[PDB]
Every structure is written in structure tokens, then in C-alpha cells.
Design an enzyme around this catalytic site. Structure first.
Site, mmCIF file in Angstrom:
data_model
loop_
_atom_site.group_PDB
_atom_site.id
_atom_site.type_symbol
_atom_site.label_atom_id
_atom_site.label_comp_id
_atom_site.label_asym_id
_atom_site.label_seq_id
_atom_site.Cartn_x
_atom_site.Cartn_y
_atom_site.Cartn_z
ATOM 1 N N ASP A 7 -8.558 -62.072 -8.268
ATOM 2 C CA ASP A 7 -9.484 -63.015 -8.911
ATOM 3 C C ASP A 7 -9.273 -64.446 -8.408
ATOM 4 O OD1 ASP A 7 -11.487 -63.857 -10.635
ATOM 5 O OD2 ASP A 7 -10.162 -64.067 -12.368
ATOM 6 N N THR A 30 -14.706 -62.670 -6.879
ATOM 7 C CA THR A 30 -15.243 -63.970 -7.240
ATOM 8 C C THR A 30 -16.564 -63.894 -7.990
ATOM 9 O OG1 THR A 30 -15.983 -66.123 -6.381
ATOM 10 C CG2 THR A 30 -16.367 -64.191 -4.998
ATOM 11 N N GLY A 31 -16.884 -64.980 -8.691
ATOM 12 C CA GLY A 31 -18.157 -65.112 -9.374
ATOM 13 C C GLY A 31 -19.247 -65.607 -8.447
ATOM 14 N N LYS A 183 -15.968 -56.751 -12.566
ATOM 15 C CA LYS A 183 -15.174 -56.682 -11.346
ATOM 16 C C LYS A 183 -14.291 -55.440 -11.416
ATOM 17 C CE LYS A 183 -14.830 -61.673 -11.852
ATOM 18 N NZ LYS A 183 -13.926 -62.856 -11.796
ATOM 19 N N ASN A 207 -12.576 -62.437 -17.769
ATOM 20 C CA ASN A 207 -13.426 -61.294 -17.406
ATOM 21 C C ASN A 207 -12.762 -60.350 -16.400
ATOM 22 O OD1 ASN A 207 -15.744 -63.013 -15.092
ATOM 23 N ND2 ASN A 207 -13.563 -62.488 -14.946
#
Length: 240
Positions: A7, A30-31, A183, A207
């Protein structure tokens, strides 16, 4: 252990070059879109068709070279609903795709330019009738000044809350994606595709719960995440 999901520092670059040279698949998580992490991938030697990255919080997994491997998107009808609500409630609105940011805002939000530039992804302006029906809509977001976003937060239809995942990732952003797209959950797919299994993986925020519970060796760096975890540490630390 042959696959590490991380992350989101030379000591950290090095510890990666390590596990990599030793023949480990290092999977960034990643976002942002892939372009959001391209810079770190460059600095860590990682690339090609055999290296991987989950982007958009697991709404997409892909090879560093670009091929989408799995994906969990919003439908075109979803986009229509979301976008039609953006105009009702008078907030700027964009969607992210693995290749492009799309907006129908003719007066483009300062924040959309911010995003485009920081994340390194171009912008294709399309009036709504022209947003292509065959898009891979990974992420949808109301993007605006906080008083506006606040009004959006305050007026979010119950229906969207149920239909999708709706979290406020910033004072100026509210992101919308697939109701079931973690994820953790997606790494499960990337792993099954590489002919591997949970007990070969180590994962490394909030998350990430699904990412730890899947991993045979999940490791934490919050306090509900530390629970499920199988250990705690800082990255190079866990690596070695």
C-alpha cells in the site's frame, strides 16, 4: 514468500531491488491510476509484462506495461446516474479511466487540473453524449471546493450509498467505485492468475483489511488493521 503487495526513501528502494533480484514479484497498491505510481516504479527497476500493480484501490489490476488484467468498473448506466446528479446538485464531476480523466465540465475544476497534473494523467473533455460507451470506468468523483463537496456529502442519495462505494478521500474529492472492489479482493485474482496462492504473499492504512486477511503473511505498519494482521513494523524493515 514470492509476492509482496505494498500500500501507499533510498533504504526502501534498496530493500526492493533486493526482494526483486531474489526473484520476487513486488506489487504496488494505490488509489491512483498506474500513472500515479509510474515514478516509483521507474526508480525501483520494476516494469514490463511480468511485473504488476493494482490501481484504483483494486478496481483494476494490470501489468506494468499496461495490459489490464482484471477490472471492476461502474457501468455506463451508473455513469449516467452519477453524472446527472452532479448537474442537479451543481458540483463538478469527473471519471477516471486507465488512460484518461474524463469530464463534461466546460468550466474545468481547479481540482481536476490538480489531479491531472499530480497524477500525470491527461484530460479528455467530452460532452456527456460523447463519453464513449466502451470505457473502462474505474473511478468516479465529484470534484469541487469544500463547501460544494460538503453539500454533496450532505445530499448523497441513499441509493448511491447502497449501489456503490462512496468515500470522501479529500475535502475537495468524493470518489465513487464498485461496491465490491478491494485491493485485498483483487490481489486474490492477480495471484490466482500467476499460479500462486495466499500463503506465498505478504501484504503491507484503513482500506487494507481485505489485503491482510487474504495474505498468509499480512503485516501492518490504524488499529483494526493491526488486529487481522499477522505482524507489525518500516517497509524495508518488513521486507528483510
Amino acid at each position: 514468500i514470492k509476492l509482496i503487495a505494498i500500500d501507499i526513501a533510498q533504504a526502501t528502494i534498496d530493500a526492493v531491488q533486493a526482494a526483486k533480484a531474489q526473484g520476487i514479484k513486488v506489487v504496488l497498491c494505490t488509489g491512483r491510476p498506474l500513472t500515479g505510481v509510474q515514478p516509483y516504479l521507474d526508480a525501483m527497476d520494476i516494469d514490463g509484462d511480468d511485473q504488476y500493480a493494482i490501481t484504483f484501490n483494486g478496481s483494476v489490476a494490470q501489468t506494468i506495461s499496461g495490459k489490464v488484467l482484471t477490472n471492476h468498473s461502474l457501468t455506463y448506466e451508473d455513469y449516467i446516474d452519477l453524472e446527472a446528479w452532479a448537474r442537479k446538485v451543481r458540483a463538478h464531476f469527473q471519471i477516471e479511466t486507465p488512460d484518461y480523466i474524463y469530464t463534461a465540465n466546460k468550466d474545468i475544476s481547479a481540482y481536476t487540473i490538480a489531479e491531472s497534473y499530480l497524477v500525470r494523467m491527461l484530460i479528455q473533455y467530452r460532452e456527456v453524449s460523447e463519453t464513449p460507451r466502451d470505457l473502462t470506468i474505474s473511478k468516479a468523483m465529484f470534484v469541487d471546493y469544500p463547501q460544494v463537496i460538503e453539500q454533496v456529502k450532505a445530499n448523497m442519495p441513499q441509493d448511491f450509498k447502497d449501489r456503490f462505494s462512496v468515500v470522501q478521500s479529500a475535502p475537495y474529492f468524493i470518489e465513487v467505485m464498485n461496491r465490491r472492489a478491494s485491493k485485498g479482493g483483487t490481489l486474490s485474482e492477480l495471484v490466482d492468475q500467476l499460479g500462486l496462492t495466499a500463503d506465498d504473499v505478504m501484504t503491507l492504512q484503513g482500506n487494507d483489511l481485505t489485503m491482510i486477511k487474504y495474505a498468509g503473511l499480512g503485516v501492518a505498519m490504524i488499529d483494526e488493521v493491526k488486529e487481522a494482521a499477522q505482524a507489525v513494523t518500516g517497509v524495508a524493515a518488513a521486507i528483510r
